[PDB]
Amino acid sequence: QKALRPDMGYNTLANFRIEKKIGRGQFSEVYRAACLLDGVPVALKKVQIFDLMDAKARADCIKEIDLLKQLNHPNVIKYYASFIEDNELNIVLELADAGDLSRMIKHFKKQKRLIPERTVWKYFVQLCSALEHMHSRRVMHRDIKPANVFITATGVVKLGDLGLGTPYYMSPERIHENGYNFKSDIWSLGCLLYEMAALQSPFYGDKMNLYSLCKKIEQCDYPPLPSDHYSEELRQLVNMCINPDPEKRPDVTYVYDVAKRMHACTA
Ligand SMILES: CN(C)CCCNS(=O)(=O)c1cccc(Nc2nc(OCC3CCCCC3)c3[nH]cnc3n2)c1
């Protein structure tokens, strides 16, 4: 406990008491922390740009989180502040109480119980409005994975803003190094919906090889879903969002539209 300056709000580590290390970080170190000013709890990602990032990388790296600031939407986590302290770069964002979707898929795979299509839309639909908002404002969520989709005790899904520029869901464009574009978010969004209904990524196997993995991705050879429990509309939707050719994947809005229609049907 050091001199807490209340005039800097959430812009100093001196106004937060770190509770626990709630984050898994090869590149990060998130913490469940509590503020000493208004007591609101928050998460605190401790990025290690220190020397691991060149000045040119740092500049744009901070330029993007400033854009992350430019987004308010219930289904995406909010950016409360960011600052350099200890030469680390600390980012404080909203904490989600309940837990992680990645931590829940293994939960259902643990109980050998599938996820009914009724709920898959209950969560997916929120995740599309969220992404639609980022795409609405030309923001590109660069790492959509189950380990970045958290739910609140209420049940709202908070999308986790990360970024750059093995990732969980690799893109066809990124294998060829063609470039990450808006429809590359449609890719991971597709594979994600697949993972909720199949309890595991689309392109996988006991091999664990790196070569065969993408030769499948550009080919699009994934194990079809069980039509007994998942509608044709679902199985088809994800089949479109992972078409290797980006230009043949749907706009973010269309995915949101389809997700909306069937959320009503499935309730
Ligand atoms: C096992 N359980 C019963 C223990 C109780 C558990 N309670 S808990 O303490 O509040 C708890 C535990 C875990 C998650 C969360 N919610 C959360 N976690 C984040 O970091 C996750 C990390 C960051 C990216 C890569 C890997 C995942 C967030 N980052 C931004 N917002 C976040 N919100 C809360």
XYZ file of N, CA and C and ligand atoms in Angstrom:
835
model
N 0.831 -1.198 0.000
C 0.000 0.000 0.000
C 0.870 1.254 0.000
N 0.875 1.960 -1.124
C 1.636 3.189 -1.293
C 0.687 4.385 -1.301
N 1.272 5.582 -1.357
C 0.500 6.818 -1.381
C -0.542 6.785 -2.490
N -1.818 6.672 -2.121
C -2.893 6.654 -3.106
C -3.268 8.090 -3.448
N -3.117 8.454 -4.718
C -3.498 9.776 -5.187
C -4.875 9.682 -5.824
N -5.921 10.266 -5.227
C -7.262 10.141 -5.813
C -7.511 11.067 -6.990
N -6.585 11.977 -7.295
C -6.771 12.896 -8.407
C -6.482 12.253 -9.755
N -5.766 11.131 -9.776
C -5.471 10.422 -11.012
C -6.485 9.330 -11.318
N -7.547 9.224 -10.526
C -8.563 8.220 -10.789
C -7.958 6.845 -10.954
N -8.293 6.194 -12.067
C -7.823 4.849 -12.357
C -6.532 4.847 -13.168
N -5.748 5.924 -13.099
C -4.538 6.065 -13.900
C -3.271 5.840 -13.083
N -3.352 5.042 -12.023
C -2.163 4.690 -11.262
C -2.422 3.390 -10.516
N -1.401 2.534 -10.463
C -1.503 1.301 -9.697
C -1.663 1.559 -8.207
N -1.500 2.805 -7.764
C -1.643 3.167 -6.361
C -3.095 3.271 -5.918
N -4.052 3.103 -6.831
C -5.469 3.180 -6.502
C -6.174 1.837 -6.660
N -5.421 0.739 -6.657
C -5.990 -0.592 -6.801
C -5.249 -1.560 -5.894
N -5.999 -2.463 -5.268
C -5.440 -3.536 -4.451
C -5.642 -4.845 -5.205
N -4.553 -5.395 -5.746
C -4.648 -6.612 -6.542
C -5.080 -7.763 -5.646
N -6.162 -8.440 -6.032
C -6.714 -9.533 -5.220
C -6.060 -10.860 -5.595
N -6.309 -11.335 -6.816
C -5.810 -12.630 -7.260
C -5.348 -12.540 -8.710
N -4.588 -13.554 -9.133
C -4.100 -13.655 -10.510
C -5.103 -14.483 -11.303
N -6.087 -13.801 -11.888
C -7.235 -14.464 -12.494
C -6.989 -14.711 -13.976
N -5.780 -14.438 -14.438
C -5.465 -14.485 -15.861
C -4.416 -15.523 -16.205
N -4.586 -16.148 -17.366
C -3.592 -17.039 -17.953
C -2.880 -16.264 -19.057
N -1.593 -15.989 -18.856
C -0.889 -15.076 -19.731
C 0.508 -15.495 -20.132
N 0.648 -15.990 -21.364
C 1.967 -16.077 -21.976
C 2.452 -14.698 -22.402
N 1.521 -13.815 -22.771
C 1.827 -12.446 -23.162
C 1.212 -11.430 -22.205
N 0.608 -11.882 -21.109
C -0.201 -11.011 -20.268
C -0.124 -11.490 -18.824
N -0.913 -10.849 -17.961
C -1.018 -11.229 -16.559
C -2.200 -10.506 -15.921
N -3.422 -10.907 -16.279
C -4.610 -10.235 -15.769
C -4.762 -10.508 -14.277
N -5.400 -9.569 -13.578
C -5.605 -9.668 -12.141
C -7.017 -9.224 -11.793
N -7.638 -9.929 -10.852
C -8.899 -9.489 -10.258
C -8.553 -8.495 -9.158
N -8.771 -7.211 -9.428
C -8.377 -6.146 -8.521
C -9.597 -5.352 -8.078
N -9.418 -4.598 -6.999
C -10.459 -3.737 -6.459
C -9.908 -2.328 -6.312
N -10.718 -1.343 -6.681
C -10.302 0.047 -6.597
C -10.486 0.572 -5.178
N -9.581 1.457 -4.771
C -9.623 2.053 -3.444
C -10.386 3.371 -3.408
N -10.841 3.871 -4.556
C -11.552 5.144 -4.608
C -13.062 4.951 -4.486
N -13.665 4.209 -5.413
C -15.097 3.943 -5.371
C -15.411 2.469 -5.151
N -14.399 1.645 -4.891
C -14.619 0.251 -4.578
C -15.088 -0.610 -5.727
N -15.292 -0.042 -6.911
C -15.731 -0.857 -8.049
C -14.649 -1.880 -8.374
N -14.985 -3.151 -8.581
C -13.961 -4.125 -8.961
C -13.694 -4.090 -10.456
N -12.472 -4.471 -10.824
C -12.009 -4.391 -12.203
C -11.001 -5.504 -12.455
N -10.679 -5.707 -13.727
C -9.563 -6.543 -14.141
C -8.409 -5.647 -14.575
N -7.188 -6.162 -14.448
C -5.989 -5.378 -14.747
C -5.002 -6.264 -15.500
N -4.918 -6.069 -16.815
C -3.962 -6.801 -17.633
C -2.613 -6.095 -17.602
N -1.571 -6.832 -17.226
C -0.217 -6.287 -17.127
C 0.560 -6.738 -18.359
N 0.492 -5.932 -19.419
C 1.254 -6.218 -20.626
C 2.723 -5.899 -20.385
N 3.602 -6.718 -20.958
C 5.036 -6.536 -20.786
C 5.677 -5.976 -22.049
N 5.283 -4.767 -22.457
C 5.941 -4.148 -23.603
C 7.370 -3.763 -23.238
N 7.572 -3.264 -22.009
C 8.883 -2.965 -21.433
C 9.955 -2.845 -22.506
N 10.631 -3.957 -22.797
C 11.561 -4.040 -23.910
C 11.119 -5.028 -24.980
N 10.115 -5.863 -24.702
C 9.638 -6.836 -25.674
C 8.970 -6.188 -26.879
N 8.702 -4.885 -26.830
C 8.125 -4.154 -27.951
C 9.034 -2.991 -28.317
N 9.338 -2.866 -29.606
C 10.082 -1.716 -30.091
C 9.194 -0.475 -30.069
N 9.839 0.692 -30.056
C 9.098 1.943 -29.932
C 8.031 2.064 -31.014
N 8.346 1.632 -32.238
C 7.361 1.686 -33.315
C 6.154 0.813 -32.997
N 6.386 -0.354 -32.391
C 5.276 -1.210 -31.988
C 4.484 -0.576 -30.852
N 5.181 -0.027 -29.856
C 4.512 0.611 -28.729
C 3.525 1.674 -29.197
N 3.970 2.557 -30.094
C 3.155 3.693 -30.512
C 1.782 3.246 -31.000
N 1.753 2.378 -32.013
C 0.477 1.897 -32.531
C -0.237 1.014 -31.518
N 0.518 0.237 -30.737
C -0.090 -0.580 -29.694
C -0.961 0.267 -28.778
N -0.460 1.433 -28.370
C -1.261 2.329 -27.546
C -2.315 3.036 -28.389
N -2.038 3.259 -29.676
C -3.016 3.913 -30.538
C -4.298 3.099 -30.647
N -4.193 1.768 -30.611
C -5.369 0.918 -30.763
C -6.209 0.885 -29.491
N -5.571 0.720 -28.328
C -6.327 0.726 -27.079
C -7.056 2.051 -26.914
N -6.502 3.133 -27.470
C -7.236 4.392 -27.517
C -8.497 4.252 -28.358
N -8.441 3.438 -29.415
C -9.643 3.134 -30.183
C -10.577 2.227 -29.393
N -10.020 1.235 -28.691
C -10.824 0.421 -27.786
C -11.636 1.312 -26.857
N -11.071 2.458 -26.468
C -11.817 3.437 -25.690
C -13.091 3.866 -26.409
N -13.060 3.932 -27.738
C -14.142 4.542 -28.513
C -15.301 3.580 -28.747
N -15.609 2.748 -27.753
C -16.625 1.710 -27.901
C -17.359 1.528 -26.582
N -18.671 1.751 -26.598
C -19.537 1.488 -25.454
C -20.701 0.644 -25.953
N -20.828 -0.577 -25.433
C -21.844 -1.523 -25.891
C -21.956 -2.593 -24.814
N -23.167 -2.966 -24.389
C -23.283 -3.831 -23.201
C -22.558 -5.155 -23.347
N -22.488 -5.701 -24.559
C -21.962 -7.043 -24.769
C -20.457 -7.077 -25.011
N -19.769 -5.934 -24.933
C -18.309 -5.887 -24.941
C -17.828 -5.255 -23.646
N -16.719 -5.779 -23.118
C -16.155 -5.226 -21.899
C -15.739 -3.780 -22.150
N -15.813 -2.970 -21.102
C -15.525 -1.548 -21.190
C -14.076 -1.294 -20.791
N -13.498 -0.241 -21.370
C -12.100 0.133 -21.173
C -12.104 1.265 -20.150
N -11.675 0.980 -18.922
C -11.753 1.992 -17.874
C -10.535 2.915 -17.875
N -9.349 2.401 -18.200
C -8.187 3.270 -18.348
C -6.987 2.457 -18.820
N -5.926 3.176 -19.187
C -4.663 2.578 -19.597
C -3.548 3.573 -19.312
N -2.353 3.050 -19.046
C -1.235 3.897 -18.651
C 0.027 3.054 -18.540
N 1.174 3.729 -18.617
C 2.474 3.104 -18.403
C 2.893 3.331 -16.955
N 3.253 2.250 -16.266
C 3.765 2.333 -14.903
C 4.694 1.151 -14.669
N 5.872 1.426 -14.111
C 6.957 0.458 -13.990
C 7.520 0.070 -15.349
N 7.199 0.835 -16.396
C 7.573 0.540 -17.777
C 6.743 -0.610 -18.340
N 6.069 -1.364 -17.474
C 4.949 -2.175 -17.923
C 3.846 -1.260 -18.449
N 2.976 -1.819 -19.283
C 1.776 -1.120 -19.730
C 0.575 -1.815 -19.102
N -0.103 -1.114 -18.200
C -1.241 -1.658 -17.476
C -2.530 -1.176 -18.125
N -3.460 -2.102 -18.339
C -4.768 -1.798 -18.904
C -5.815 -2.336 -17.942
N -6.709 -1.466 -17.485
C -7.773 -1.841 -16.560
C -9.085 -1.850 -17.333
N -9.785 -2.982 -17.291
C -11.053 -3.149 -17.983
C -12.067 -3.784 -17.040
N -13.322 -3.802 -17.485
C -14.388 -4.413 -16.705
C -14.076 -5.878 -16.427
N -14.390 -6.316 -15.214
C -14.292 -7.720 -14.843
C -15.666 -8.366 -14.965
N -15.696 -9.576 -15.516
C -16.927 -10.343 -15.655
C -16.996 -11.375 -14.538
N -18.120 -11.393 -13.821
C -18.211 -12.173 -12.591
C -18.208 -13.671 -12.875
N -19.133 -14.135 -13.718
C -19.408 -15.563 -13.843
C -18.173 -16.362 -14.239
N -17.682 -16.171 -15.459
C -16.521 -16.927 -15.897
C -16.315 -16.828 -17.389
N -15.688 -17.863 -17.943
C -15.214 -17.882 -19.320
C -15.954 -18.952 -20.108
N -16.236 -18.656 -21.380
C -16.817 -19.667 -22.257
C -15.843 -20.817 -22.475
N -14.566 -20.502 -22.712
C -13.548 -21.544 -22.793
C -13.578 -22.428 -21.555
N -13.737 -21.819 -20.377
C -13.846 -22.579 -19.140
C -15.167 -23.328 -19.028
N -16.158 -22.996 -19.855
C -17.441 -23.686 -19.837
C -17.538 -24.795 -20.872
N -16.925 -24.623 -22.044
C -16.925 -25.690 -23.041
C -16.279 -26.942 -22.463
N -15.125 -26.781 -21.810
C -14.515 -27.906 -21.112
C -15.412 -28.406 -19.989
N -16.245 -27.526 -19.428
C -17.183 -27.944 -18.393
C -18.219 -28.909 -18.953
N -18.747 -28.617 -20.142
C -19.730 -29.499 -20.759
C -19.067 -30.736 -21.348
N -17.912 -30.569 -21.997
C -17.116 -31.724 -22.391
C -16.706 -32.554 -21.183
N -16.643 -31.939 -19.999
C -16.325 -32.686 -18.788
C -17.492 -33.569 -18.367
N -18.715 -33.051 -18.463
C -19.910 -33.793 -18.086
C -20.489 -34.604 -19.239
N -19.799 -34.657 -20.379
C -20.279 -35.396 -21.546
C -21.680 -34.945 -21.951
N -22.016 -33.696 -21.641
C -23.318 -33.122 -21.956
C -23.150 -32.051 -23.023
N -23.932 -32.152 -24.095
C -23.857 -31.179 -25.172
C -24.521 -29.866 -24.754
N -24.398 -28.868 -25.619
C -25.004 -27.555 -25.412
C -26.226 -27.463 -26.312
N -27.440 -27.363 -25.770
C -28.623 -27.300 -26.636
C -28.583 -26.080 -27.545
N -29.073 -26.261 -28.774
C -29.116 -25.162 -29.730
C -29.896 -23.969 -29.195
N -30.814 -24.190 -28.251
C -31.579 -23.082 -27.688
C -30.658 -22.042 -27.062
N -29.640 -22.492 -26.323
C -28.738 -21.565 -25.652
C -27.641 -21.061 -26.580
N -27.167 -21.904 -27.502
C -26.112 -21.489 -28.423
C -26.468 -20.159 -29.072
N -27.737 -19.987 -29.451
C -28.179 -18.699 -29.968
C -28.307 -17.667 -28.854
N -28.639 -18.106 -27.635
C -28.775 -17.175 -26.519
C -27.483 -16.402 -26.287
N -26.337 -17.054 -26.483
C -25.040 -16.411 -26.312
C -24.486 -15.869 -27.625
N -24.624 -16.627 -28.715
C -24.057 -16.199 -29.989
C -24.679 -14.891 -30.462
N -25.992 -14.730 -30.275
C -26.674 -13.537 -30.772
C -26.077 -12.282 -30.150
N -25.808 -12.320 -28.843
C -25.191 -11.176 -28.184
C -23.812 -10.895 -28.766
N -23.051 -11.952 -29.053
C -21.701 -11.798 -29.577
C -21.682 -11.192 -30.973
N -22.798 -11.246 -31.704
C -22.845 -10.655 -33.037
C -23.130 -9.159 -32.976
N -24.076 -8.744 -32.129
C -24.303 -7.319 -31.915
C -23.017 -6.641 -31.472
N -22.325 -7.258 -30.515
C -21.034 -6.763 -30.064
C -20.094 -6.538 -31.238
N -19.811 -7.603 -31.989
C -18.918 -7.483 -33.133
C -19.469 -6.497 -34.153
N -20.783 -6.523 -34.380
C -21.391 -5.536 -35.265
C -21.057 -4.124 -34.805
N -21.010 -3.903 -33.489
C -20.677 -2.579 -32.977
C -19.230 -2.221 -33.294
N -18.305 -3.153 -33.060
C -16.912 -2.915 -33.418
C -16.769 -2.728 -34.923
N -17.398 -3.607 -35.706
C -17.419 -3.418 -37.150
C -18.216 -2.179 -37.532
N -19.239 -1.833 -36.744
C -19.982 -0.604 -36.998
C -19.061 0.606 -36.956
N -18.068 0.585 -36.067
C -17.131 1.689 -35.901
C -15.740 1.335 -36.422
N -15.676 0.438 -37.404
C -14.445 0.116 -38.121
C -13.367 -0.462 -37.210
N -13.727 -0.899 -36.012
C -12.784 -1.575 -35.130
C -12.751 -3.053 -35.493
N -11.562 -3.646 -35.429
C -11.357 -5.048 -35.785
C -10.910 -5.814 -34.546
N -11.841 -6.533 -33.922
C -11.476 -7.468 -32.867
C -10.618 -8.566 -33.481
N -9.336 -8.610 -33.127
C -8.388 -9.447 -33.847
C -8.258 -10.858 -33.291
N -8.705 -11.111 -32.058
C -8.558 -12.431 -31.439
C -9.881 -12.839 -30.796
N -10.810 -13.315 -31.619
C -12.067 -13.870 -31.131
C -11.847 -15.358 -30.881
N -11.776 -15.738 -29.614
C -11.610 -17.124 -29.210
C -12.501 -17.381 -28.008
N -12.771 -18.648 -27.693
C -13.593 -18.938 -26.508
C -12.981 -18.420 -25.220
N -11.658 -18.278 -25.166
C -10.976 -17.765 -23.985
C -11.046 -16.247 -23.874
N -11.797 -15.585 -24.757
C -11.993 -14.143 -24.690
C -13.470 -13.769 -24.669
N -14.357 -14.731 -24.436
C -15.797 -14.503 -24.397
C -16.251 -14.899 -22.998
N -16.515 -13.905 -22.155
C -16.909 -14.126 -20.772
C -18.359 -13.714 -20.569
N -19.013 -14.371 -19.616
C -20.414 -14.119 -19.308
C -20.511 -13.530 -17.909
N -21.520 -12.691 -17.709
C -21.821 -12.130 -16.402
C -22.768 -13.057 -15.646
N -22.834 -12.860 -14.328
C -23.797 -13.603 -13.523
C -25.201 -13.459 -14.096
N -25.546 -12.257 -14.564
C -26.834 -12.049 -15.218
C -27.012 -13.001 -16.394
N -25.979 -13.140 -17.225
C -26.050 -13.990 -18.397
C -25.606 -13.284 -19.661
N -25.444 -11.959 -19.592
C -24.924 -11.221 -20.736
C -23.497 -11.675 -21.012
N -23.158 -11.823 -22.290
C -21.804 -12.198 -22.682
C -21.019 -10.926 -22.951
N -19.879 -10.791 -22.286
C -18.965 -9.682 -22.513
C -17.847 -10.157 -23.436
N -17.725 -9.516 -24.598
C -16.669 -9.839 -25.551
C -15.370 -9.176 -25.114
N -14.252 -9.899 -25.202
C -12.981 -9.405 -24.704
C -12.111 -8.755 -25.762
N -11.840 -7.455 -25.585
C -11.070 -6.711 -26.588
C -9.579 -6.962 -26.387
N -8.959 -7.637 -27.358
C -7.511 -7.779 -27.451
C -7.080 -7.193 -28.794
N -5.867 -7.484 -29.239
C -5.473 -7.056 -30.564
C -3.998 -7.249 -30.826
N -3.656 -7.078 -32.099
C -2.283 -6.988 -32.585
C -2.306 -6.080 -33.814
N -1.257 -6.149 -34.629
C -1.191 -5.381 -35.861
C -1.585 -3.925 -35.703
N 0.419 -19.985 -31.529
C -0.735 -20.293 -32.368
C -1.992 -19.587 -31.863
N -2.588 -18.715 -32.680
C -3.923 -18.210 -32.338
C -4.938 -19.338 -32.405
N -5.906 -19.304 -31.487
C -6.849 -20.410 -31.361
C -7.456 -20.769 -32.713
N -8.106 -19.803 -33.357
C -8.684 -19.987 -34.685
C -7.805 -19.250 -35.688
N -7.119 -20.005 -36.539
C -6.257 -19.426 -37.557
C -7.039 -19.201 -38.844
N -6.691 -18.131 -39.542
C -7.408 -17.703 -40.727
C -6.741 -18.236 -41.991
N -7.497 -18.390 -43.080
C -6.845 -18.702 -44.360
C -5.949 -17.579 -44.845
N -6.354 -16.323 -44.629
C -5.536 -15.197 -45.060
C -4.216 -15.147 -44.302
N -4.221 -15.542 -43.030
C -3.017 -15.423 -42.216
C -2.012 -16.529 -42.517
N -2.471 -17.678 -43.017
C -1.542 -18.724 -43.437
C -0.710 -18.236 -44.616
N -1.374 -17.693 -45.633
C -0.693 -17.112 -46.781
C -0.093 -15.744 -46.481
N -0.303 -15.210 -45.278
C 0.165 -13.870 -44.924
C -0.415 -12.823 -45.872
N -1.661 -13.043 -46.301
C -2.325 -12.110 -47.204
C -2.781 -10.847 -46.487
N -3.095 -10.944 -45.196
C -3.491 -9.787 -44.419
C -4.813 -9.959 -43.700
N -4.859 -9.530 -42.441
C -6.074 -9.604 -41.640
C -7.043 -8.505 -42.063
N -8.268 -8.895 -42.413
C -9.309 -7.954 -42.812
C -10.570 -8.230 -42.000
N -11.615 -7.439 -42.259
C -12.832 -7.536 -41.459
C -13.421 -8.940 -41.504
N -13.425 -9.567 -42.681
C -14.021 -10.891 -42.809
C -13.198 -11.976 -42.129
N -11.951 -11.693 -41.747
C -11.216 -12.640 -40.918
C -11.835 -12.751 -39.531
N -12.537 -11.707 -39.080
C -13.322 -11.821 -37.858
C -14.523 -12.731 -38.067
N -15.081 -12.741 -39.281
C -16.168 -13.660 -39.596
C -15.683 -15.099 -39.509
N -14.415 -15.340 -39.838
C -13.841 -16.675 -39.737
C -13.931 -17.189 -38.307
N -13.196 -16.554 -37.391
C -13.191 -17.002 -36.003
C -14.601 -17.045 -35.432
N -15.454 -16.100 -35.833
C -16.840 -16.124 -35.381
C -17.530 -17.411 -35.816
N -17.189 -17.915 -37.001
C -17.724 -19.177 -37.469
C -17.201 -20.346 -36.664
N -15.875 -20.503 -36.630
C -15.270 -21.572 -35.844
C -15.744 -21.547 -34.397
N -15.996 -20.357 -33.848
C -16.466 -20.266 -32.470
C -17.842 -20.904 -32.321
N -18.795 -20.504 -33.168
C -20.121 -21.114 -33.127
C -20.031 -22.624 -33.291
N -19.111 -23.092 -34.135
C -18.887 -24.526 -34.262
C -18.454 -25.128 -32.931
N -17.524 -24.466 -32.237
C -16.985 -25.026 -31.003
C -18.056 -25.146 -29.924
N -19.016 -24.217 -29.889
C -20.077 -24.300 -28.892
C -20.981 -25.501 -29.134
N -21.183 -25.879 -30.396
C -22.041 -27.006 -30.732
C -21.289 -28.326 -30.813
N -19.976 -28.291 -31.051
C -19.171 -29.499 -31.140
C -18.255 -29.708 -29.943
N -18.132 -28.723 -29.056
C -17.311 -28.820 -27.854
C -15.819 -28.861 -28.160
N -15.407 -28.394 -29.336
C -13.997 -28.384 -29.708
C -13.862 -27.738 -31.079
N -12.654 -27.248 -31.364
C -12.419 -26.469 -32.567
C -12.786 -27.275 -33.811
N -12.978 -26.599 -34.951
C -13.338 -27.322 -36.178
C -12.177 -28.119 -36.749
N -11.010 -27.487 -36.846
C -9.821 -28.103 -37.426
C -8.905 -28.546 -36.291
N -8.815 -29.854 -36.084
C -8.143 -30.421 -34.920
C -7.801 -31.873 -35.246
N -7.352 -32.611 -34.246
C -7.038 -34.017 -34.420
C -5.996 -34.468 -33.419
N -5.804 -35.789 -33.369
C -4.785 -36.365 -32.499
C -3.387 -36.153 -33.061
N -3.277 -36.001 -34.382
C -2.001 -35.667 -35.007
C -1.332 -34.486 -34.312
N -2.050 -33.372 -34.167
C -1.527 -32.124 -33.615
C -0.533 -31.445 -34.560
N -0.269 -32.037 -35.730
C 0.569 -31.457 -36.779
C 0.220 -29.999 -37.057
N 1.200 -29.258 -37.592
C 0.966 -27.896 -38.066
C 0.737 -27.825 -39.570
N 1.357 -28.711 -40.356
C 1.154 -28.671 -41.800
C -0.255 -29.116 -42.173
N -0.624 -30.346 -41.800
C -1.929 -30.872 -42.185
C -3.058 -29.959 -41.731
N -2.837 -29.180 -40.671
C -3.913 -28.368 -40.114
C -4.436 -27.368 -41.139
N -3.536 -26.635 -41.800
C -3.988 -25.561 -42.677
C -4.370 -26.083 -44.054
N -3.636 -27.074 -44.566
C -4.065 -27.739 -45.791
C -5.521 -28.164 -45.683
N -5.988 -28.436 -44.463
C -7.410 -28.642 -44.227
C -8.169 -27.320 -44.238
N -7.583 -26.271 -43.655
C -8.270 -24.985 -43.565
C -8.542 -24.426 -44.957
N -7.516 -24.393 -45.812
C -7.728 -23.928 -47.178
C -8.620 -24.890 -47.953
N -8.649 -26.162 -47.554
C -9.565 -27.118 -48.162
C -10.946 -27.052 -47.527
N -11.015 -26.702 -46.243
C -12.271 -26.677 -45.505
C -12.792 -28.092 -45.284
N -11.985 -28.932 -44.645
C -12.350 -30.313 -44.340
C -12.483 -30.427 -42.823
N -13.694 -30.183 -42.320
C -13.976 -30.270 -40.895
C -15.084 -31.285 -40.635
N -15.079 -31.939 -39.476
C -16.105 -32.952 -39.188
C -17.482 -32.322 -39.083
N -18.417 -32.691 -39.962
C -19.761 -32.106 -39.887
C -20.385 -32.301 -38.513
N -21.366 -31.453 -38.214
C -22.059 -31.482 -36.936
C -23.209 -32.479 -36.967
N -23.678 -32.923 -35.797
C -24.838 -33.825 -35.765
C -26.140 -33.111 -36.090
N -26.729 -33.425 -37.246
C -27.983 -32.801 -37.647
C -29.146 -33.173 -36.738
N -28.974 -34.161 -35.856
C -30.063 -34.564 -34.973
C -30.352 -33.509 -33.912
N -29.350 -32.711 -33.536
C -29.503 -31.741 -32.463
C -29.254 -30.300 -32.880
N -28.803 -30.051 -34.106
C -28.490 -28.701 -34.555
C -29.117 -28.463 -35.918
N -29.807 -27.333 -36.047
C -30.605 -27.053 -37.229
C -29.729 -26.914 -38.470
N -30.357 -27.122 -39.630
C -29.682 -26.866 -40.896
C -29.228 -25.416 -40.980
N -30.042 -24.492 -40.463
C -29.684 -23.079 -40.506
C -28.371 -22.822 -39.778
N -28.189 -23.435 -38.608
C -26.931 -23.298 -37.882
C -25.785 -23.923 -38.667
N -25.887 -25.224 -38.951
C -24.824 -25.922 -39.667
C -24.444 -25.191 -40.948
N -25.425 -24.586 -41.620
C -25.132 -23.841 -42.838
C -24.456 -22.513 -42.523
N -24.959 -21.791 -41.519
C -24.397 -20.492 -41.168
C -22.887 -20.579 -40.981
N -22.443 -21.421 -40.044
C -21.013 -21.567 -39.796
C -20.293 -22.041 -41.049
N -20.948 -22.866 -41.868
C -20.319 -23.324 -43.100
C -20.015 -22.162 -44.037
N -20.795 -21.081 -43.956
C -20.542 -19.905 -44.779
C -19.441 -19.036 -44.187
N -19.440 -18.873 -42.865
C -18.483 -18.005 -42.197
C -17.065 -18.552 -42.213
N -16.842 -19.750 -42.747
C -15.501 -20.318 -42.789
C -15.163 -20.738 -44.213
N -15.835 -20.142 -45.186
C -15.489 -20.365 -46.581
C -14.085 -19.823 -46.827
N -13.124 -20.654 -47.249
C -11.733 -20.172 -47.342
C -11.578 -18.859 -48.092
N -12.342 -18.655 -49.151
C -12.316 -17.388 -49.869
C -13.029 -16.324 -49.045
N -12.336 -15.291 -48.556
C -13.024 -14.303 -47.709
C -14.235 -13.675 -48.373
N -14.139 -13.354 -49.665
C -15.201 -12.612 -50.332
C -16.516 -13.377 -50.372
N -16.495 -14.681 -50.112
C -17.712 -15.482 -50.103
C -18.255 -15.723 -48.701
N -17.650 -15.131 -47.683
C -18.213 -15.141 -46.343
C -19.172 -13.971 -46.179
N -20.133 -14.074 -45.267
C -21.151 -13.028 -45.155
C -20.667 -11.829 -44.357
N -21.268 -10.680 -44.653
C -21.026 -9.486 -43.860
C -21.418 -9.740 -42.406
N -20.827 -8.952 -41.504
C -21.102 -9.125 -40.082
C -22.587 -8.962 -39.792
N -23.272 -8.100 -40.545
C -24.684 -7.848 -40.279
C -25.523 -9.087 -40.568
N -25.316 -9.705 -41.733
C -26.088 -10.888 -42.098
C -26.019 -11.949 -41.006
N -24.817 -12.205 -40.481
C -24.677 -13.168 -39.392
C -25.516 -12.737 -38.198
N -25.510 -11.439 -37.889
C -26.323 -10.935 -36.788
C -27.806 -11.119 -37.079
N -28.222 -10.862 -38.320
C -29.625 -11.035 -38.681
C -30.068 -12.477 -38.467
N -29.325 -13.431 -39.034
C -29.682 -14.839 -38.891
C -29.700 -15.239 -37.421
N -28.710 -14.780 -36.652
C -28.671 -15.102 -35.230
C -29.904 -14.570 -34.514
N -30.392 -13.398 -34.927
C -31.562 -12.807 -34.286
C -32.817 -13.617 -34.584
N -33.071 -13.887 -35.867
C -34.265 -14.623 -36.270
C -34.462 -15.867 -35.415
N -33.423 -16.691 -35.296
C -33.568 -17.990 -34.654
C -33.471 -17.925 -33.138
N -32.985 -16.821 -32.573
C -33.079 -16.648 -31.129
C -34.536 -16.560 -30.695
N -35.371 -15.901 -31.502
C -36.801 -15.854 -31.220
C -37.436 -17.226 -31.407
N -37.117 -17.897 -32.518
C -37.652 -19.233 -32.761
C -37.278 -20.189 -31.633
N -36.070 -20.052 -31.095
C -35.561 -20.964 -30.071
C -35.796 -20.389 -28.675
N -37.057 -20.079 -28.395
C -37.442 -19.540 -27.096
C -38.960 -19.517 -26.951
C -12.719 -21.672 -10.655
N -13.693 -20.674 -10.243
C -14.745 -21.312 -9.470
C -13.036 -19.635 -9.462
C -13.913 -18.384 -9.368
C -13.458 -17.333 -10.383
N -13.958 -16.021 -9.996
S -13.221 -14.593 -10.595
O -12.043 -14.219 -9.807
O -14.089 -13.435 -10.366
C -12.808 -14.766 -12.363
C -12.067 -15.850 -12.807
C -11.755 -15.979 -14.151
C -12.181 -15.023 -15.057
C -12.917 -13.936 -14.614
N -13.418 -12.876 -15.472
C -12.543 -12.101 -16.338
N -11.331 -12.644 -16.618
C -10.475 -12.002 -17.402
O -9.198 -12.471 -17.757
C -9.223 -13.744 -18.343
C -7.894 -14.082 -19.050
C -7.484 -12.935 -19.976
C -7.165 -13.328 -21.422
C -6.502 -14.695 -21.638
C -6.831 -15.749 -20.581
C -8.093 -15.393 -19.808
C -10.821 -10.780 -17.940
N -10.167 -9.934 -18.746
C -10.957 -8.879 -18.970
N -12.099 -9.071 -18.304
C -12.014 -10.247 -17.666
N -12.877 -10.903 -16.869
C -13.234 -13.809 -13.271
